[PDB]
Design a protein around this ligand. Structure first.
Ligand SMILES: [Cl-]
Lengths: 250, 249
DNA sequence: CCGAATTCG
DNA sequence: CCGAATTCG
Protein backbone atom coordinates (compact mmCIF):
# COMPACT_ATOMS: atom_id res chain seq x y z
CA UNK A 1 0.00 0.00 0.00
CA UNK A 2 0.92 3.71 0.11
CA UNK A 3 1.67 3.51 3.86
CA UNK A 4 4.89 2.28 5.48
CA UNK A 5 5.65 1.55 9.13
CA UNK A 6 8.85 0.88 11.01
CA UNK A 7 10.25 0.46 14.51
CA UNK A 8 13.57 1.75 15.77
CA UNK A 9 14.74 0.36 19.09
CA UNK A 10 17.94 -0.02 21.08
CA UNK A 11 17.36 -3.44 22.64
CA UNK A 12 20.37 -3.33 25.01
CA UNK A 13 22.13 -6.59 24.23
CA UNK A 14 24.93 -5.50 26.56
CA UNK A 15 22.61 -6.17 29.51
CA UNK A 16 22.93 -9.92 30.02
CA UNK A 17 20.18 -10.21 32.63
CA UNK A 18 16.95 -11.83 31.46
CA UNK A 19 18.16 -11.50 27.89
CA UNK A 20 16.22 -14.51 26.53
CA UNK A 21 12.99 -13.28 28.11
CA UNK A 22 13.65 -9.74 26.89
CA UNK A 23 14.36 -10.93 23.35
CA UNK A 24 11.03 -12.78 23.43
CA UNK A 25 9.41 -9.57 24.64
CA UNK A 26 10.85 -7.67 21.68
CA UNK A 27 9.61 -10.30 19.25
CA UNK A 28 6.16 -9.95 20.83
CA UNK A 29 6.03 -6.26 19.94
CA UNK A 30 7.25 -7.11 16.43
CA UNK A 31 4.47 -9.68 16.03
CA UNK A 32 1.92 -7.28 17.56
CA UNK A 33 2.66 -4.35 15.21
CA UNK A 34 4.23 -6.12 12.20
CA UNK A 35 6.14 -3.11 10.84
CA UNK A 36 7.70 -3.15 7.39
CA UNK A 37 11.16 -2.32 8.75
CA UNK A 38 12.93 -2.57 12.10
CA UNK A 39 16.09 -0.70 13.08
CA UNK A 40 17.79 -2.36 16.05
CA UNK A 41 20.83 -1.17 17.98
CA UNK A 42 22.96 -3.02 20.54
CA UNK A 43 22.32 -6.44 19.01
CA UNK A 44 24.66 -9.27 20.00
CA UNK A 45 25.17 -12.51 18.03
CA UNK A 46 22.93 -14.59 20.35
CA UNK A 47 20.19 -11.95 20.27
CA UNK A 48 20.54 -12.03 16.51
CA UNK A 49 19.93 -15.79 16.42
CA UNK A 50 16.88 -15.45 18.67
CA UNK A 51 15.41 -13.12 16.01
CA UNK A 52 15.92 -15.63 13.18
CA UNK A 53 13.66 -18.06 15.08
CA UNK A 54 10.87 -15.94 16.59
CA UNK A 55 10.89 -13.17 13.93
CA UNK A 56 11.36 -15.41 10.92
CA UNK A 57 9.20 -13.18 8.70
CA UNK A 58 12.06 -10.64 8.56
CA UNK A 59 15.38 -10.63 6.73
CA UNK A 60 18.22 -9.50 8.99
CA UNK A 61 20.88 -7.16 7.58
CA UNK A 62 23.65 -6.49 10.09
CA UNK A 63 26.48 -3.98 10.49
CA UNK A 64 28.80 -6.60 12.03
CA UNK A 65 28.59 -10.04 13.63
CA UNK A 66 30.94 -9.67 16.62
CA UNK A 67 30.74 -7.56 19.74
CA UNK A 68 27.61 -5.44 19.68
CA UNK A 69 26.13 -3.99 16.52
CA UNK A 70 23.05 -2.64 14.75
CA UNK A 71 20.71 -4.42 12.39
CA UNK A 72 17.95 -3.61 9.93
CA UNK A 73 15.15 -6.15 9.56
CA UNK A 74 13.17 -6.18 6.30
CA UNK A 75 9.67 -7.66 6.17
CA UNK A 76 9.60 -10.52 3.68
CA UNK A 77 6.91 -10.20 1.04
CA UNK A 78 6.72 -6.43 1.47
CA UNK A 79 10.32 -5.16 1.27
CA UNK A 80 12.85 -6.39 -1.29
CA UNK A 81 16.56 -5.95 -0.61
CA UNK A 82 18.90 -4.44 -3.19
CA UNK A 83 22.24 -3.70 -1.53
CA UNK A 84 23.98 -2.70 1.68
CA UNK A 85 27.01 -0.66 2.72
CA UNK A 86 28.72 0.13 6.02
CA UNK A 87 30.21 3.60 6.39
CA UNK A 88 32.81 3.48 9.18
CA UNK A 89 33.26 6.07 11.89
CA UNK A 90 37.07 6.39 11.70
CA UNK A 91 37.30 7.88 15.19
CA UNK A 92 34.81 5.77 17.13
CA UNK A 93 36.18 4.16 20.26
CA UNK A 94 33.00 2.06 20.65
CA UNK A 95 32.95 0.23 17.29
CA UNK A 96 30.13 2.42 16.00
CA UNK A 97 29.42 2.81 12.29
CA UNK A 98 26.65 3.66 9.84
CA UNK A 99 24.64 0.86 8.27
CA UNK A 100 23.00 1.64 4.91
CA UNK A 101 20.57 -0.70 3.16
CA UNK A 102 18.94 0.09 -0.17
CA UNK A 103 15.55 -1.53 -0.72
CA UNK A 104 12.33 -1.30 -2.70
CA UNK A 105 9.07 -0.97 -0.77
CA UNK A 106 5.60 -0.44 -2.18
CA UNK A 107 7.18 0.28 -5.55
CA UNK A 108 9.41 3.11 -4.28
CA UNK A 109 13.16 3.19 -3.67
CA UNK A 110 14.47 3.69 -0.13
CA UNK A 111 17.88 4.06 1.50
CA UNK A 112 17.50 2.80 5.08
CA UNK A 113 20.15 3.84 7.58
CA UNK A 114 20.73 3.16 11.27
CA UNK A 115 23.51 3.83 13.72
CA UNK A 116 24.31 3.90 17.41
CA UNK A 117 26.22 7.15 17.81
CA UNK A 118 28.93 7.41 20.47
CA UNK A 119 27.57 7.25 24.02
CA UNK A 120 27.82 9.25 27.25
CA UNK A 121 28.28 12.93 28.01
CA UNK A 122 32.10 12.77 27.88
CA UNK A 123 32.05 11.76 24.18
CA UNK A 124 30.04 14.76 22.97
CA UNK A 125 32.69 15.76 20.43
CA UNK A 126 32.84 12.41 18.62
CA UNK A 127 29.05 12.08 18.76
CA UNK A 128 28.73 15.43 16.95
CA UNK A 129 31.31 14.35 14.36
CA UNK A 130 29.38 11.14 13.71
CA UNK A 131 26.11 13.09 13.38
CA UNK A 132 27.74 15.21 10.67
CA UNK A 133 28.87 12.07 8.84
CA UNK A 134 25.33 10.65 8.98
CA UNK A 135 23.66 13.86 7.76
CA UNK A 136 26.33 14.20 5.08
CA UNK A 137 25.66 10.74 3.72
CA UNK A 138 21.90 11.41 3.81
CA UNK A 139 22.45 14.35 1.46
CA UNK A 140 24.95 12.50 -0.75
CA UNK A 141 22.61 9.53 -1.28
CA UNK A 142 21.23 9.27 -4.84
CA UNK A 143 18.80 12.01 -5.80
CA UNK A 144 16.24 9.39 -6.85
CA UNK A 145 16.00 7.73 -3.41
CA UNK A 146 14.03 8.50 -0.28
CA UNK A 147 16.31 8.29 2.78
CA UNK A 148 15.22 7.27 6.28
CA UNK A 149 17.62 7.33 9.23
CA UNK A 150 16.43 5.84 12.52
CA UNK A 151 18.76 5.05 15.38
CA UNK A 152 20.02 5.73 18.87
CA UNK A 153 21.61 9.18 18.51
CA UNK A 154 22.48 9.73 22.19
CA UNK A 155 21.96 13.43 21.36
CA UNK A 156 21.34 16.28 23.74
CA UNK A 157 19.37 19.22 22.35
CA UNK A 158 22.34 21.54 22.94
CA UNK A 159 24.57 19.41 20.69
CA UNK A 160 22.31 19.72 17.65
CA UNK A 161 22.47 23.50 17.99
CA UNK A 162 26.25 23.38 18.41
CA UNK A 163 26.32 21.29 15.24
CA UNK A 164 24.38 23.80 13.10
CA UNK A 165 20.89 22.30 13.32
CA UNK A 166 19.40 19.84 10.86
CA UNK A 167 19.89 20.73 7.16
CA UNK A 168 16.90 22.32 5.49
CA UNK A 169 16.18 19.10 3.53
CA UNK A 170 16.45 16.67 6.47
CA UNK A 171 13.47 16.35 8.81
CA UNK A 172 13.07 15.00 12.33
CA UNK A 173 9.80 13.05 12.31
CA UNK A 174 8.96 13.89 15.93
CA UNK A 175 9.50 17.58 15.13
CA UNK A 176 7.46 17.29 11.93
CA UNK A 177 4.57 15.88 14.00
CA UNK A 178 4.57 18.83 16.40
CA UNK A 179 6.95 17.53 19.09
CA UNK A 180 4.14 15.54 20.77
CA UNK A 181 4.72 14.87 24.45
CA UNK A 182 3.58 11.25 24.58
CA UNK A 183 6.69 9.99 22.76
CA UNK A 184 9.30 12.66 23.50
CA UNK A 185 11.49 10.73 25.93
CA UNK A 186 12.68 7.38 24.59
CA UNK A 187 15.05 6.81 27.53
CA UNK A 188 13.51 7.55 30.95
CA UNK A 189 14.85 6.25 34.26
CA UNK A 190 11.73 7.20 36.20
CA UNK A 191 9.36 5.11 34.07
CA UNK A 192 11.98 2.46 33.30
CA UNK A 193 14.00 0.57 35.89
CA UNK A 194 16.16 -1.86 33.86
CA UNK A 195 19.39 -0.04 34.68
CA UNK A 196 18.59 0.43 38.41
CA UNK A 197 19.41 4.14 38.30
CA UNK A 198 17.93 5.80 41.42
CA UNK A 199 17.72 9.24 39.88
CA UNK A 200 15.20 10.35 37.29
CA UNK A 201 16.67 11.19 33.90
CA UNK A 202 14.89 11.45 30.57
CA UNK A 203 16.18 12.10 27.08
CA UNK A 204 15.07 11.84 23.48
CA UNK A 205 18.03 9.69 22.46
CA UNK A 206 16.19 7.82 19.70
CA UNK A 207 15.37 9.84 16.58
CA UNK A 208 14.07 9.45 13.02
CA UNK A 209 15.47 11.61 10.19
CA UNK A 210 14.28 11.51 6.58
CA UNK A 211 15.03 13.14 3.23
CA UNK A 212 12.30 13.14 0.58
CA UNK A 213 10.90 15.14 -2.30
CA UNK A 214 8.53 17.85 -1.05
CA UNK A 215 5.37 16.20 0.21
CA UNK A 216 6.40 12.68 -0.78
CA UNK A 217 7.01 11.31 2.72
CA UNK A 218 4.58 12.44 5.41
CA UNK A 219 4.78 11.12 9.00
CA UNK A 220 1.40 10.10 10.40
CA UNK A 221 2.19 9.00 13.95
CA UNK A 222 4.85 8.21 16.51
CA UNK A 223 4.33 5.96 19.54
CA UNK A 224 6.42 4.33 22.23
CA UNK A 225 6.67 0.54 22.22
CA UNK A 226 8.09 -1.92 24.71
CA UNK A 227 6.04 -0.39 27.52
CA UNK A 228 4.72 -3.67 28.93
CA UNK A 229 6.87 -4.98 31.76
CA UNK A 230 7.74 -8.65 31.34
CA UNK A 231 7.12 -11.61 33.67
CA UNK A 232 10.56 -11.03 35.23
CA UNK A 233 9.67 -7.49 36.35
CA UNK A 234 11.82 -5.73 33.73
CA UNK A 235 11.11 -4.20 30.32
CA UNK A 236 12.57 -5.47 27.05
CA UNK A 237 15.12 -2.63 27.09
CA UNK A 238 16.19 0.43 29.04
CA UNK A 239 15.00 2.34 25.95
CA UNK A 240 11.52 2.52 24.62
CA UNK A 241 11.16 1.77 20.95
CA UNK A 242 9.64 4.20 18.44
CA UNK A 243 6.86 3.03 16.11
CA UNK A 244 6.34 5.30 13.12
CA UNK A 245 3.89 5.13 10.22
CA UNK A 246 4.33 7.39 7.18
CA UNK A 247 2.37 7.99 4.00
CA UNK A 248 4.11 7.80 0.63
CA UNK A 249 2.44 9.88 -2.10
CA UNK A 250 3.04 9.40 -5.83
CA UNK B 1 66.84 21.51 75.63
CA UNK B 2 63.77 23.57 74.60
CA UNK B 3 63.36 21.68 71.34
CA UNK B 4 60.80 19.28 69.88
CA UNK B 5 61.16 16.91 66.95
CA UNK B 6 58.43 15.05 65.13
CA UNK B 7 57.70 13.12 61.96
CA UNK B 8 54.46 12.98 60.00
CA UNK B 9 54.10 10.13 57.55
CA UNK B 10 51.29 8.56 55.55
CA UNK B 11 52.60 4.98 55.64
CA UNK B 12 49.98 3.64 53.19
CA UNK B 13 48.63 0.71 55.19
CA UNK B 14 46.12 0.20 52.34
CA UNK B 15 48.93 -0.97 50.01
CA UNK B 16 49.01 -4.69 50.74
CA UNK B 17 52.28 -5.34 48.91
CA UNK B 18 55.32 -5.96 51.10
CA UNK B 19 53.58 -4.47 54.12
CA UNK B 20 55.69 -6.46 56.65
CA UNK B 21 58.95 -5.40 54.97
CA UNK B 22 57.67 -1.82 54.76
CA UNK B 23 56.55 -1.64 58.40
CA UNK B 24 60.04 -2.84 59.33
CA UNK B 25 61.36 -0.02 57.14
CA UNK B 26 59.20 2.56 58.91
CA UNK B 27 60.33 1.42 62.37
CA UNK B 28 63.99 1.45 61.35
CA UNK B 29 63.63 5.09 60.22
CA UNK B 30 61.86 6.01 63.45
CA UNK B 31 64.79 4.51 65.35
CA UNK B 32 67.49 6.35 63.38
CA UNK B 33 65.90 9.75 64.06
CA UNK B 34 64.04 8.89 67.29
CA UNK B 35 61.69 11.90 67.20
CA UNK B 36 59.67 12.99 70.21
CA UNK B 37 56.37 12.59 68.34
CA UNK B 38 55.24 10.66 65.26
CA UNK B 39 52.00 11.37 63.37
CA UNK B 40 51.00 8.44 61.16
CA UNK B 41 48.17 8.21 58.66
CA UNK B 42 46.68 5.19 56.88
CA UNK B 43 47.58 2.84 59.70
CA UNK B 44 45.60 -0.42 59.82
CA UNK B 45 45.04 -2.81 62.76
CA UNK B 46 47.86 -5.32 62.09
CA UNK B 47 50.21 -2.46 61.21
CA UNK B 48 49.30 -0.85 64.53
CA UNK B 49 49.86 -4.10 66.44
CA UNK B 50 53.25 -4.40 64.75
CA UNK B 51 54.13 -0.88 65.92
CA UNK B 52 53.23 -1.64 69.54
CA UNK B 53 55.89 -4.37 69.49
CA UNK B 54 58.77 -2.98 67.42
CA UNK B 55 58.20 0.66 68.49
CA UNK B 56 57.88 -0.02 72.22
CA UNK B 57 59.73 3.22 73.01
CA UNK B 58 56.49 4.94 71.92
CA UNK B 59 52.98 5.08 73.32
CA UNK B 60 50.49 4.69 70.46
CA UNK B 61 47.35 6.84 70.58
CA UNK B 62 44.58 5.89 68.15
CA UNK B 63 40.87 6.31 67.55
CA UNK B 64 38.54 3.53 66.46
CA UNK B 65 41.27 1.17 65.19
CA UNK B 66 38.74 0.08 62.56
CA UNK B 67 39.34 0.24 58.82
CA UNK B 68 42.27 2.55 58.19
CA UNK B 69 42.98 5.31 60.66
CA UNK B 70 45.63 7.66 61.99
CA UNK B 71 47.84 7.38 65.03
CA UNK B 72 50.13 9.53 67.13
CA UNK B 73 53.18 8.00 68.81
CA UNK B 74 54.67 9.58 71.95
CA UNK B 75 58.23 8.78 73.01
CA UNK B 76 58.23 7.46 76.57
CA UNK B 77 60.32 9.41 79.05
CA UNK B 78 59.94 12.57 76.98
CA UNK B 79 56.22 13.12 76.28
CA UNK B 80 53.63 12.70 79.03
CA UNK B 81 50.17 11.77 77.77
CA UNK B 82 47.28 13.80 79.16
CA UNK B 83 44.09 13.40 77.10
CA UNK B 84 42.77 12.62 73.65
CA UNK B 85 39.76 13.64 71.60
CA UNK B 86 38.32 12.75 68.21
CA UNK B 87 36.59 15.47 66.21
CA UNK B 88 34.38 14.10 63.40
CA UNK B 89 34.24 15.29 59.81
CA UNK B 90 30.45 14.97 59.57
CA UNK B 91 30.30 14.90 55.75
CA UNK B 92 33.29 12.65 55.08
CA UNK B 93 32.69 9.70 52.77
CA UNK B 94 36.09 8.19 53.66
CA UNK B 95 35.88 7.74 57.44
CA UNK B 96 38.23 10.67 58.04
CA UNK B 97 38.41 12.57 61.30
CA UNK B 98 40.69 14.80 63.38
CA UNK B 99 42.73 13.11 66.12
CA UNK B 100 43.92 15.43 68.90
CA UNK B 101 46.28 14.55 71.75
CA UNK B 102 47.19 16.88 74.61
CA UNK B 103 50.64 16.23 76.08
CA UNK B 104 53.33 17.70 78.30
CA UNK B 105 56.80 17.88 76.76
CA UNK B 106 59.84 19.60 78.24
CA UNK B 107 57.49 21.37 80.64
CA UNK B 108 55.28 22.98 77.98
CA UNK B 109 51.72 22.04 77.02
CA UNK B 110 51.16 20.84 73.46
CA UNK B 111 48.00 20.05 71.52
CA UNK B 112 49.18 17.64 68.81
CA UNK B 113 46.75 17.09 65.94
CA UNK B 114 46.73 14.86 62.88
CA UNK B 115 44.29 13.83 60.19
CA UNK B 116 44.13 12.42 56.68
CA UNK B 117 41.90 14.81 54.72
CA UNK B 118 39.54 13.61 51.99
CA UNK B 119 41.46 12.33 48.97
CA UNK B 120 41.43 12.83 45.19
CA UNK B 121 40.80 16.00 43.19
CA UNK B 122 37.07 15.24 42.82
CA UNK B 123 36.48 15.72 46.56
CA UNK B 124 38.01 19.21 46.73
CA UNK B 125 34.94 20.66 48.46
CA UNK B 126 34.87 18.24 51.40
CA UNK B 127 38.66 18.60 51.73
CA UNK B 128 38.38 22.38 52.08
CA UNK B 129 35.51 21.95 54.57
CA UNK B 130 37.69 19.60 56.64
CA UNK B 131 40.57 22.09 56.48
CA UNK B 132 38.29 24.79 57.94
CA UNK B 133 37.42 22.45 60.82
CA UNK B 134 41.12 21.76 61.43
CA UNK B 135 42.02 25.46 61.45
CA UNK B 136 38.93 25.99 63.58
CA UNK B 137 40.11 23.62 66.31
CA UNK B 138 43.62 25.09 66.24
CA UNK B 139 42.11 28.51 66.98
CA UNK B 140 39.95 27.32 69.88
CA UNK B 141 42.68 25.58 71.89
CA UNK B 142 43.83 27.35 75.08
CA UNK B 143 46.23 30.23 74.47
CA UNK B 144 48.91 28.83 76.80
CA UNK B 145 49.06 25.66 74.69
CA UNK B 146 51.28 25.16 71.64
CA UNK B 147 49.17 23.70 68.82
CA UNK B 148 50.86 21.63 66.12
CA UNK B 149 48.93 19.98 63.31
CA UNK B 150 50.73 17.50 61.09
CA UNK B 151 49.04 15.21 58.60
CA UNK B 152 48.17 14.34 55.02
CA UNK B 153 46.10 17.30 53.81
CA UNK B 154 45.86 16.19 50.16
CA UNK B 155 45.77 19.90 49.38
CA UNK B 156 46.40 21.12 45.85
CA UNK B 157 47.50 24.45 44.50
CA UNK B 158 44.78 27.09 44.90
CA UNK B 159 42.71 25.04 47.36
CA UNK B 160 44.13 26.88 50.39
CA UNK B 161 43.29 30.26 48.84
CA UNK B 162 39.79 29.23 47.72
CA UNK B 163 39.40 28.37 51.42
CA UNK B 164 40.39 31.90 52.47
CA UNK B 165 44.07 31.32 53.28
CA UNK B 166 45.55 30.60 56.68
CA UNK B 167 44.65 32.65 59.77
CA UNK B 168 47.16 35.24 60.91
CA UNK B 169 48.43 33.20 63.88
CA UNK B 170 48.67 29.84 62.01
CA UNK B 171 51.87 29.22 60.03
CA UNK B 172 52.82 26.47 57.57
CA UNK B 173 56.26 25.22 58.63
CA UNK B 174 57.49 24.77 55.06
CA UNK B 175 56.43 28.32 54.16
CA UNK B 176 57.97 29.75 57.35
CA UNK B 177 61.35 28.21 56.37
CA UNK B 178 61.36 29.94 52.97
CA UNK B 179 59.72 27.21 50.87
CA UNK B 180 62.94 25.16 50.65
CA UNK B 181 62.90 22.97 47.55
CA UNK B 182 64.75 20.07 49.21
CA UNK B 183 61.53 18.92 50.89
CA UNK B 184 58.78 20.50 48.79
CA UNK B 185 57.11 17.38 47.39
CA UNK B 186 56.03 14.63 49.79
CA UNK B 187 54.31 12.55 47.08
CA UNK B 188 56.28 12.20 43.84
CA UNK B 189 55.55 9.45 41.32
CA UNK B 190 58.80 10.27 39.51
CA UNK B 191 61.03 9.72 42.55
CA UNK B 192 58.80 7.13 44.28
CA UNK B 193 57.55 4.20 42.22
CA UNK B 194 55.48 2.25 44.80
CA UNK B 195 52.13 2.97 43.14
CA UNK B 196 53.51 2.06 39.70
CA UNK B 197 51.97 5.18 38.14
CA UNK B 198 53.51 5.76 34.68
CA UNK B 199 53.09 9.53 34.61
CA UNK B 200 55.04 12.04 36.70
CA UNK B 201 53.00 13.82 39.41
CA UNK B 202 54.36 15.89 42.33
CA UNK B 203 52.43 17.34 45.27
CA UNK B 204 53.01 18.81 48.72
CA UNK B 205 50.24 16.70 50.26
CA UNK B 206 51.85 16.49 53.71
CA UNK B 207 51.95 19.66 55.75
CA UNK B 208 52.77 20.99 59.20
CA UNK B 209 50.69 23.81 60.69
CA UNK B 210 51.43 25.41 64.03
CA UNK B 211 49.85 28.17 66.09
CA UNK B 212 52.28 29.86 68.44
CA UNK B 213 52.65 33.32 69.96
CA UNK B 214 54.94 35.80 68.32
CA UNK B 215 58.41 34.39 68.45
CA UNK B 216 57.48 31.50 70.71
CA UNK B 217 57.89 28.71 68.13
CA UNK B 218 60.52 28.77 65.37
CA UNK B 219 60.99 25.97 62.81
CA UNK B 220 64.64 24.91 62.73
CA UNK B 221 64.67 22.20 60.09
CA UNK B 222 62.43 20.19 57.82
CA UNK B 223 63.65 17.13 55.93
CA UNK B 224 62.23 14.23 54.00
CA UNK B 225 62.43 10.69 55.39
CA UNK B 226 61.79 7.22 54.03
CA UNK B 227 64.11 7.96 51.10
CA UNK B 228 65.96 4.63 51.27
CA UNK B 229 64.53 1.97 49.00
CA UNK B 230 64.15 -1.34 50.82
CA UNK B 231 65.58 -4.80 50.13
CA UNK B 232 62.27 -5.79 48.49
CA UNK B 233 62.75 -3.01 45.91
CA UNK B 234 60.09 -0.57 47.13
CA UNK B 235 59.90 2.33 49.56
CA UNK B 236 58.36 2.21 53.04
CA UNK B 237 55.51 4.27 51.56
CA UNK B 238 54.42 6.13 48.43
CA UNK B 239 54.75 9.25 50.59
CA UNK B 240 57.98 10.63 51.95
CA UNK B 241 57.75 11.42 55.60
CA UNK B 242 58.59 14.84 57.04
CA UNK B 243 61.05 15.28 59.90
CA UNK B 244 60.75 18.59 61.71
CA UNK B 245 62.53 20.17 64.65
CA UNK B 246 61.12 23.30 66.30
CA UNK B 247 62.66 25.45 69.01
CA UNK B 248 60.43 26.65 71.84
CA UNK B 249 61.26 29.96 73.50
C1' DC C 1 46.79 7.68 45.37
C1' DC C 2 47.01 10.10 39.19
C1' DG C 3 43.26 9.80 36.05
C1' DA C 4 41.17 7.22 32.02
C1' DA C 5 38.49 3.26 31.58
C1' DT C 6 35.26 0.69 33.77
C1' DT C 7 31.68 -0.66 37.20
C1' DC C 8 27.13 -0.26 39.49
C1' DG C 9 22.91 1.14 42.41
C1' DC D 1 23.47 4.07 29.85
C1' DC D 2 23.42 8.58 34.65
C1' DG D 3 27.30 9.80 37.00
C1' DA D 4 29.77 8.83 41.62
C1' DA D 5 32.79 5.05 42.93
C1' DT D 6 36.07 1.92 41.75
C1' DT D 7 40.15 0.15 39.38
C1' DC D 8 44.96 -0.26 37.77
C1' DG D 9 49.08 0.82 34.84
CL1 LIG E 1 3.18 -2.36 32.95
Amino acid sequence: SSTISFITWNIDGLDGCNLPERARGVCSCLALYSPDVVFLQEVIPPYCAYLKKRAASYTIITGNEEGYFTAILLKKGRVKFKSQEIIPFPNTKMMRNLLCVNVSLGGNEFCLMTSHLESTREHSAERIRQLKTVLGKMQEAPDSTTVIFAGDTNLRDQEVIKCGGLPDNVFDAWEFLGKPKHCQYTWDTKANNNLRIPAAYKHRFDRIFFRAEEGHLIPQSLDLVGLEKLDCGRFPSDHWGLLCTLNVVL
